[PDB]
Amino acid sequence: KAKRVQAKIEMEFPSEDVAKVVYEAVLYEHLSVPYRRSEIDFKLEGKKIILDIKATDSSALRGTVNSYLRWIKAAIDVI
Amino acid sequence: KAKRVQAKIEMEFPSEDVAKVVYEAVLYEHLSVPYRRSEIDFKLEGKKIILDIKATDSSALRGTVNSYLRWIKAAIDVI
DSSP states (O other), X not given: OOOOEEEEEEEEOSOHHHHHHHHHHHTHHHHTOOXXXXXXXXXXXXXXXXXXXXXXXXXXXXXXXXXXXXXHHHHHTOO | OOOXXXXXXXXXXXXXXXHHHHHHHHHHHHHSOSSOXXXXXXXXXXXXXXXXXXXXXXXXXXXXXXXXXXXXXXXXXXX
């Protein structure tokens, strides 16, 4: 019985060409997944990586935040 | 190499008094656990709940949601 739900993550990194890097690859596995759950407007601008999300509900979200915070570490791993 | 990582969350609920129950459960659970890592600012204000989370890294950020989102979703099921 949970209604409208929204999440926002920012992250800090060493080089912009290391935020460029982390942001720009997590993107290719985000474009490579149609049928997402449930709403996203990821974006890098500096050395921050910005993640804003939405979920029909409490868990339409949690498993997705998981999904991408690993994917974001999975990206830190090759660096 | 993820320097500081932060997620602000907001949940809107049926009754400004059905959310008051969840706060209280979770808050209890967030507080029947001193030594609680990493950083959590739990504030019920209105029909909305705002879970502020500051962490050491993506991973820190990550698991300090699951157990806490899965607490919220727990409170939800005793109603």
